[PDB]
């Protein structure tokens, strides 16, 4: 039926302007009362309402953003555009556009959503990570994959031969605008002197591949 | 504007359970309230529109009721696909507000975290900074508190941490916290301690190390 897809840049520099586009099909912005809204969600946080525009063109913005937001619609393109100015790291989140039914009762909900586009606000340039050891009947060891950009990075242990006990944590975007994540694995103490542990790090974005061995 | 308060904010349950979550508004929104289920990595999905109408295609186990300032969403029998985060939204007033969400995870016996602390590495130390990390491994429930102390001074504002998704096999969570200091600061202190507070620990746990020892 109705589907929508958000598009725009995944990476934006603080201060700049964020322009988002919502392309949809299964409905048109000329059907009576129909709306298209924008909802954002910061990493691990709740949904936040941004704005909405309708068939007859009225629109509403979130009060606490409204001097920074501009929503428009091109009906021959079947797209809705959202412009957010002077973005900052706190604007890093996943942006969703969604459809709202018009009166035929059930206009009370956003019934179909886009898959969302995740946008990250940072002033940094591509940069590979440095890999540091996290070292010591159960023992834990790991690797600190620090200061890389942009996401993502892949981590495996012993070239994939080691999987259970492994926990690769969600990376955190630091105040420096660079990512940092840890991958740890818990193993038997007795294994520490005969078994070797190496984390394999790969940051394709900058192609920095690193194999880092950690014992104690 | 209009405050929508969802509760409980976090909830623990098992497959086959019957649960009811609430969303309440600071002002009356009539019947203009919708409910969504959101699974990690996926967009919200409409369940209930106009407070009590089941959205076409949504399973019959889902139901909603309420009007004015009180609303509830009930899941007659919890399924695996329901362990997610639920949100309510009112579309009666502008701006359209979303609640803070309700988190439904898999219930299992309480499991205290295994804690480990890792001093910064020598190699990192000359890059100019020191990252000391604390690992809280395989615990349940999710709520956990990490407190960093350096020479007994409570640290604030200089640590970040992330949690893993609930494990598919054992239903536990693991948490990682990183305390970041300049090298100079790292070298002028001795005891580095990570104190963990969690439902499974009768008393907070402290893992520590003395820099040069």
């Amino acid at each position: 039926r109705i589907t929508l897809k958000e598009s725009g840049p995944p990476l934006v520099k603080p201060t700049q302007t964020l322009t988002l586009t919502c392309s949809f099909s299964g409905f048109s912005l000329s059907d009576f009362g129909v709306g298209v809204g924008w909802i954002r969600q910061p990493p691990g946080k709740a949904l936040e309402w941004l704005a909405i525009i309708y068939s007859d063109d009225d629109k509403r913005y979130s009060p606490s953003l409204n001097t920074r937001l501009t929503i428009t619609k091109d009906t021959s393109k079947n797209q809705v555009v959202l412009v957010m100015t002077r973005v900052s790291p706190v604007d890093t989140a996943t942006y969703f556009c969604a459809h709202r039914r018009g009166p035929t009762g059930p206009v009370n909900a956003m019934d179909v959503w886009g898959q969302g586009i995740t946008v990250t606000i940072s002033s940094t340039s591509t940069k590979g990570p440095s890999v540091f050891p996290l070292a010591p009947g159960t023992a834990a060891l790991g690797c600190l994959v620090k200061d890389y950009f942009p996401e993502p990075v892949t981590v495996s242990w012993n070239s994939g031969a080691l999987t259970s006990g492994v926990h690769t944590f969600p990376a955190v975007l630091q105040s420096s605008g660079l990512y940092s994540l840890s991958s740890v694995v818990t193993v038997p103490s007795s294994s520490l002197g005969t078994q070797t542990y190496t984390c394999n790090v790969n940051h394709k974005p900058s192609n920095t591949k690193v194999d880092k061995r950690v014992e104690p | 504007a209009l405050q929508l308060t969802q509760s409980p904010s976090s909830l623990s349950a098992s497959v086959g359970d019957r649960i009811t979550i609430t969303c309440r508004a600071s002002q009356g929104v009539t019947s203009a309230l919708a409910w969504y289920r959101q699974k990690p990595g996926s967009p919200p999905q409409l369940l209930i529109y106009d407070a009590s109408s089941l959205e076409s295609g949504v399973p019959s186990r889902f139901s909603g009721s309420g009007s004015g300032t009180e609303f509830t969403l009930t899941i007659s029998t919890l399924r695996p696909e329901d362990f997610a985060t639920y949100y309510c939204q009112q579309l009666h007033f502008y701006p359209h507000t979303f609640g803070g969400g309700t988190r439904v995870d898999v219930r299992r016996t309480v499991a205290a975290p295994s804690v480990f602390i890792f001093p910064p590495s020598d190699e990192q130390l000359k890059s100019g900074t020191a990252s000391v990390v604390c690992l809280l491994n395989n615990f349940y429930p999710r709520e956990a508190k990490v407190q960093w102390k350096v020479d007994n001074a409570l640290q604030s504002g200089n640590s970040q941490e992330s949690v893993t998704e609930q494990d598919s096999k054992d239903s536990t969570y693991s948490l990682s916290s990183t305390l970041t200091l300049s090298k100079a600061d790292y070298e002028k202190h001795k005891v580095y301690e990570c104190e963990v507070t969690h439902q499974g620990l009768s008393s907070p746990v402290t893992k520590s190390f003395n820099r040069g020892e």
């Binding site: 009362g33 709306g35 | 009539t30 009666h92 007033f93 502008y94």
Partner: peptide
């Protein structure tokens, strides 16, 4: 202010 469909 009220939503467009509060009618």
């Amino acid at each position: 202010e009220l939503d467009k469909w509060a009618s």
